[PDB]
Amino acid sequence: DYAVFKMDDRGGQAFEAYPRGTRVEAYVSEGTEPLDNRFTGYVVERRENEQQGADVLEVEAYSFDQFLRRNTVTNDQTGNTISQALADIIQTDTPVRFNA
Amino acid sequence: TVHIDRGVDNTQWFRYDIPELGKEAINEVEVWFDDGEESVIVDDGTDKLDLQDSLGLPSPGTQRKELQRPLVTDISDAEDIGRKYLAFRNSTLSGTVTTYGLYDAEPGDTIDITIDPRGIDEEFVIAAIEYRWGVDETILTVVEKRGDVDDILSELSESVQRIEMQGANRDAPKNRITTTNAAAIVSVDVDAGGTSADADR
Amino acid sequence: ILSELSESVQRIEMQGANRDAPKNRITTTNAAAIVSVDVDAGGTSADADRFVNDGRNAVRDAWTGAGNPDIANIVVGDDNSGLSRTNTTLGNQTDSVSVTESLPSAKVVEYSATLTQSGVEEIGLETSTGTLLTRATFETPVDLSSDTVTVTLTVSNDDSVSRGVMTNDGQTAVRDVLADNSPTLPTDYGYGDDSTAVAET
Amino acid sequence: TVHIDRGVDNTQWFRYDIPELGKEAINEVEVWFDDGEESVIVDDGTDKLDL
Amino acid sequence: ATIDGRQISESTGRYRSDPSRRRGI
Amino acid sequence: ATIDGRQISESTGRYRSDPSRRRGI
Amino acid sequence: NATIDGRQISESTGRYRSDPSRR
Amino acid sequence: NATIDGRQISESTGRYRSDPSRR
Amino acid sequence: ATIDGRQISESTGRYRSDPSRRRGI
Amino acid sequence: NATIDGRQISESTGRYRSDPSRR
Amino acid sequence: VDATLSRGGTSVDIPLVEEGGEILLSSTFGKPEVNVRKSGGSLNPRVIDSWSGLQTFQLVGKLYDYSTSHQLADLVKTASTTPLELQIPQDAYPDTVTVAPAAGQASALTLEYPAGRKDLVDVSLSLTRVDPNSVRGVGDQQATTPTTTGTGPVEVTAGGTTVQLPSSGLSVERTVGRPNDAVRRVPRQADPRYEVKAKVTNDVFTFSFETLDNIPATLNALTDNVFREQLGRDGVTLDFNGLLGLGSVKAIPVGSSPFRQVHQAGRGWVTVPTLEFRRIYSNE
Amino acid sequence: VDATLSRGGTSVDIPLVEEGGEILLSSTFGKPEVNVRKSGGSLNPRVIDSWSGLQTFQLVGKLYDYSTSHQLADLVKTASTTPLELQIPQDAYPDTVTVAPAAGQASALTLEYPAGRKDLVDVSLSLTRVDPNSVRGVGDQQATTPTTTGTGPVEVTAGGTTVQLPSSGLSVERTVGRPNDAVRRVPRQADPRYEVKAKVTNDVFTFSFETLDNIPATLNALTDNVFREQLGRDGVTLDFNGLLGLGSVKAIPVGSSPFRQVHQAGRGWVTVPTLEFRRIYSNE
Ligand SMILES: [K+]
Ligand SMILES: [Mg+2]
Ligand SMILES: [Mg+2]
Ligand SMILES: [Mg+2]
């Protein structure tokens, strides 16, 4: 899961707001409907380039599925039910909240 | 050791593309060493804690890689392997700046770059330099250069090579075969009643 | 395609590993001291200053316990060109004078000398061995006539480093490295368990 | 478990690109296991006979 | 309209590698 | 005309991978 | 305006242009 | 004249054009 | 204008492989 | 009509266009 | 009556006068940011309107002195975060609109100094309406037209040779624009955001004349020293010597058709329909 | 009066005569190879000029002989490394210049044979100036116009059916060019390099006429046999039968609009504004 935001910048002022790992949320509203938080993630890339006179900032952000992806099973669930395994793995090997 | 006196003043750039590249960065490496018989964790605390506070996670935001270097018997060497892995994956500025001239400039040289629209006013190391005739462009890569698909491919290629060459006795008896090459041309001339052939094979 | 290859390579990479192996740990920690240079030549501030790579290395080598920089001379010159980290010498040295050392506060040291020299474009701090620590340049030549040159070096924490800090005592030590003033150089390392956020104090 | 009540009516789409993807597909997998000392063949007879 | 193949391939590299970076390596 | 690098790379993905699918993996 | 397989490759840069000076 | 991320993807072929026969 | 994705990918393959060829394989 | 290294990248869509209503 | 264009303390009045049935003001209203669906299974497309609109003003008029014309060129070309304000003397418009030079255009301002006319300059302005509170920028670049008090001929200097342009049929046009400024869509305002960029502008001088005597020498000197030479990083010095109150500019002929020599049947002279110079770096 | 265009022993004098105040000779000077910076932190761009310029000659004139007209077409279309040399009767030009047929164009030469106008051919020539010493290539390809001495109608043969074009309002236009030749920038000198390529040229015949009698039969025969058939690798035989001294050519109509039937209010006949044929492979 990823998001790309495109912004105008001046004197690199907005570039400084998006260090790697900083929290980004995207909210959406159509018409008079209340804001829905549609994406939460962290910045992985900030890019600023010359686009025909414009100073264009791209912010690229990844989300929580990265933590399941970039982690490994540490202890062995041989002789566990899938229930017991899910509990063990998520609580030991991932930084996310477990709820049985 | 070297500085380029003719900097890139605000009037002397005409295109730039300056990112922070943090796509591939991780904060934990575990290196297995000896005959896979001992292990070391290289632990970037800062990045884990920052991801926790940022995202609101219940525990430090671990992102991990596992390596096996089975010929390494020294723990402090295994640390260096892991440290090197983290360092080469870290977030860095890696911008392009487009200017003119600078034929004397080399990678490893330092240069002053001022770009007011970008709020840049710094002395930078040149990572790469590219000269284009025709469009008459000098393209500076500053701080660091990173690849794209070639980075993925080279990392895989090196890994494959390392696993392929395991168990090879490097003190093995050498043998040699010589590739050599020679050719004879057979020319054909055909004459029939004083008339030469128009084509022969 | 790449994911499948990568997933395959990783599986073969880790194949011989004992996952009940003895585990060891190395922590990656990061801190920085900013040293700020101010140059005053008879009431005129320098337009630019660099703490040169030689000066950075002098402080680095001193921190390892090799030996403190012996700051001896203020050197003045007649060339404002090519100011960089990479400067090992003044552009064109015209005069040299022995310093008086003052320590106005913790974290700051002042070197000052009385000097007569026309057309001063550049000024520098120099050790007994000839190592340049700073170079500063003026946009317009300064005529000095028994005028006091002051070079002020101020030590500070780099507040951009997340979750690490150089303490007030550490910044004082860096000052004492520059001032030859018996610094409390690194001799030990500690680990603890209080998680209260880092401060200079 | 969840249904999006709104749907996509014939007036609500405005571009589409629907393939059947089948360039990766194979019909036999042989797995070596137990330090490579035993093997099992997984056999998709349908695709083999259809080809 | 003559299109430079080096320019296209070098410009698009960022985007070609991104799906892979999203998935680990 | 400004061309979106994401859309070029995303559109052409099917065609970049096909030469390898033609050869197995 | 350019397409690959019916999908637009033109970037939706939100930049205005307006009629040149008449002369 | 076409750009990706502000860089030109047009080749600097040094080939001339000059305006056609008037008719 | 309609652009053939096969033609772009076929034409540019030359240049997509060069960065990796520069680095060995 | 566009070319990379002399090869046409335009698709040979066998699709007709004909002149618009005059106005 | 008369239209005011101002930026802080600087103010220029443009008479908005023309002959007969000529267009003095054109205002275009646009929705460039509506998505109308190109396909879908209905007879008629679905749409979405979700962004700021376009308003463009095209002003035509005449100026009665050259000094004001140079002030107008300077006012249009200047990079500043201070709003450029336009006052239109017609009831269908509000008293002040905040404007940018035309959003992506090389030619926002055209000034023409036609032959046979004195103290009478043709003005064409293209302006884009922007949100008054969304003028955003960091940089500040005061434009100056070089001015002097002479009477002398227009002189082109390149490679140590000076060419005096013929006075006969001599007509001058200046185009000015700021194409590197970004005018950008905003979600729920009527008007777009103006990103003022301290970046390269458009400034072009176009001359037309008849070459009547010393014809080979005049044309050859120009073509030898300007067109058949490599000018390097430098260019032509273009000196007006006080004609129109203008001074010395550094320039280069750009592109495929900046100069043309025209020979007509039955005529003993050469026409130059265009000699076109773009202003280059010298504002250090 | 006359301008001479020559290549070795072949020489064509073109009268350079026209009516009233028509443009006989246009010369455009350019610098296609100047790099003007599109952006940067200056008000005015930095530039670099490092390559050859461009000089283009456009010659309008008349020829008084159809034989000479065919020689001019042959001369322009021929691939040869022998310089094409142009002599212009005006003092602003050097006595001879080396030329290429217009660099990228399908239309370097237009020859018009209008209705009325016996022994008057309208000539338009576009030529690019090239370095006399930098004419490079391998192959010679002599272009021959097929010539014969008949009187007969213009005949169009396809699939064993022959259509005779109406004499009424008949106009012929021929267009010739060499788009496959490279005119290439060189550093450090005034004029570009000419790469002569023994490759495909442009040769097009356009007809305009009014179909007065046997209207269905005449038009149907052309449309049914040329436009509604597939012609394959072969094409149409276009035979002039000695009109303008021309003979038999193999051609095909190309594109969206090579042929038009025009019907006008209150007229009892059909106008063909264009019938356009391109010459196809025929040399062995
Ligand atoms: K001390
Ligand atoms: Mg033979
Ligand atoms: Mg300082
Ligand atoms: Mg001391």
The DSSP result for K168-202, as a single string, is TT-EEEEEEE-TTSEEE--SS-SS-EEE------E
Nearest to C94 by CA among C112, C110, C111, C73: C73
DSSP codes joined into one string, G1-23: --EETTEE-B----B---PPP--
C139 is in an annotated binding site: no
Burial call L64-100: b when 16+ CB within 10 Å, e when fewer: eebebbbbbbbbbbbbbeebbbbbbeeebbeeebbbb
Residue C100 CA, distance from chain mean position: 20
Residues of A marked as binding for Mg(2+)? 1, 65
| DSSP conformation class of L139 | -
Beta bridge pairs of residue K4: K13, K87
Could you tell me if K9 and K71 are in contact, meaning their C-beta atoms sit under 8 angstroms apart?
A: no
The bound ligand whose nearest atom lies closest to the alpha carbon of C106 is 1
Could you tell me if G21 and K129 are in contact, meaning their C-beta atoms sit under 8 angstroms apart?
A: no
Q: Which two tokens stand for residue A18?
A: 């998006």
Residues 1-23, chain H, touching A (beta carbon < 8 A): 3, 5-6
Kindly report the backbone phi and psi dihedral angles of residue K31, in degrees, each rounded to the nearest multiple of 5, phi listed first. -120, 70
Could you list which residues have their CB under 5 Å from ion ligand 1? C 176, 182
> B16: distance to nearest CA of chain K, Å?
13
Nearest to K274 by CA among L18, L191, L127, L27: L27
Report the distance separating Cα B6 and Cα K232, nearest Å.
18
Task: Return the partners of chain I (3 or more C-beta pairs < 8 Å).
Answer: B, E, F, G, J
Report the distance separating Cα B4 and Cα C135, nearest Å.
17
Q: Which two tokens stand for residue K134?
A: 């969304």
- C147: part of which helix (H) or strand (E)? strand C132-157
Beta bridge pairs of residue K86: K5, K97
Report the distance separating Cα K15 and Cα K4, nearest Å.
9
C31 is in an annotated binding site: no
> Solved by what technique?
cryo-EM
Could you tell me if E1 and H3 are in contact, meaning their C-beta atoms sit under 8 angstroms apart?
A: no
Beta bridge pairs of residue A54: A51
Residues of A marked as binding? 1, 65
Nearest to K130 by CA among L42, G15, G13: G15
Q: How many CB atoms lie within 10 A of CB L208?
A: 18
Burial of L281 (0-12, 13-18, 19+ CB in 10 A): exposed
Report the distance separating Cα L174 and Cα L259, nearest Å.
16
The bound ligand whose nearest atom lies closest to the alpha carbon of C51 is 3
What's the resolution in A? 2.6
**Residue of E9, E12, E25 to mutate for B, most B C-beta atoms under 10 A:** E25
Q: What angle do CA C62, C63, C67 make, to 5 degrees?
A: 25
Report the distance separating Cα K102 and Cα G16, nearest Å.
9
User: How many alpha carbons fall within 13 Å on the CB side of residue C1?
Assistant: 19
Q: What angle do CA L50, L52, L53 make, to 5 degrees?
A: 110
Q: Which two tokens stand for residue A73?
A: 């099973």
Q: Which two tokens stand for residue G5?
A: 């397989």
Q: Which two tokens stand for residue L26?
A: 């246009």
Could you tell me if L184 and L197 are in contact, meaning their C-beta atoms sit under 8 angstroms apart?
A: no
Residue type, C93: Q
Q: How many CB atoms lie within 10 A of CB L209?
A: 22
Q: Give whole-number Cα distances, I11 to I6, I7, K206, L196, in Å.
A: 8, 6, 43, 27
Q: Which two tokens stand for residue K251?
A: 């320039």
Q: How many CB atoms lie within 10 A of CB I19?
A: 18
Q: Which are the contacts of K65, defined by CB distance < 8 A and separation ≥ 6?
A: K119
Q: Which are the contacts of C23, defined by CB distance < 8 A and separation ≥ 6?
A: B39, B40, B41
Report the distance separating Cα B62 and Cα A72, nearest Å.
10
Q: How many CB atoms lie within 10 A of CB L9?
A: 6
Beta bridge pairs of residue C102: C110
Task: Return the partners of chain B (3 or more C-beta pairs < 8 Å).
Answer: A, C, E, H, I, K, L
Could you tell me if K235 and K251 are in contact, meaning their C-beta atoms sit under 8 angstroms apart?
A: yes
Angular region, B93: left φ>0, alpha ψ -120 to 50, beta rest: beta
User: Cα of C40 to ligand 3 centre, how many Å?
Assistant: 10
Q: How many helices (H) and strands (E) does chain D have?
A: 1, 2
Burial of C188 (0-12, 13-18, 19+ CB in 10 A): exposed
Could you tell me if L97 and L88 are in contact, meaning their C-beta atoms sit under 8 angstroms apart?
A: yes
User: Cα of C181 to ligand 4 centre, how many Å?
Assistant: 5
Report the distance separating Cα K4 and Cα A23, nearest Å.
48
**Residue of D15, D16, D18 to mutate for G, most G C-beta atoms under 10 A:** D15
**Cα radius of gyration (chain A):** 19
Kindly report the backbone phi and psi dihedral angles of residue L175, in degrees, each rounded to the nearest multiple of 5, phi listed first. -125, 130
Residue type, A96: V
CB contact under 8 A, A13 and K138: yes
**Residue of A1, A48, A51, A60 to mutate for E, most E C-beta atoms under 10 A:** A60
Residue type, K187: P
Does the CB of J23 have a partner CB in chain L at under 8 Å? Answer: no
The bound ligand whose nearest atom lies closest to the alpha carbon of B190 is 2
Alpha helices in J1-23 (DSSP H): none
Angular region, H5: left φ>0, alpha ψ -120 to 50, beta rest: left
C176 is in an annotated binding site: no
Task: Return the partners of chain G (3 or more C-beta pairs < 8 Å).
Answer: A, D, F, I, K
User: Cα of C53 to ligand 1 centre, how many Å?
Assistant: 25
User: Cα of B194 to ligand 2 centre, how many Å?
Assistant: 15
Q: State the count of interchain CB pairs (< 8 A) between B and E.
A: 19
Nearest to C43 by CA among C165, C133, C149, C135: C149
- K126: part of which helix (H) or strand (E)? strand K121-129
Report the distance separating Cα L47 and Cα K231, nearest Å.
9
**Cα radius of gyration (chain K):** 22
Q: Which two tokens stand for residue L231?
A: 């012609």
Q: Which are the contacts of A7, defined by CB distance < 8 A and separation ≥ 6?
A: A14, A56, A57, A59
- B123: part of which helix (H) or strand (E)? strand B120-132
Alpha helices in C85-183 (DSSP H): 168-178
What is the four-CA torsion angle of C66, C67, C68, C69, rounded to 10 degrees? Answer: -100
Residues 4-23, chain J, touching E (beta carbon < 8 A): 4-5, 9
Report the distance separating Cα K98 and Cα K116, nearest Å.
36
| DSSP conformation class of K166 | P
- Name chain E contacts of J7, Cβ cutoff 8 Å: none
Q: What angle do CA C100, C105, C109 make, to 5 degrees?
A: 35
Chain K residues at the D interface, defined by Cβ less than 8 Å, are 37-42, 45-46
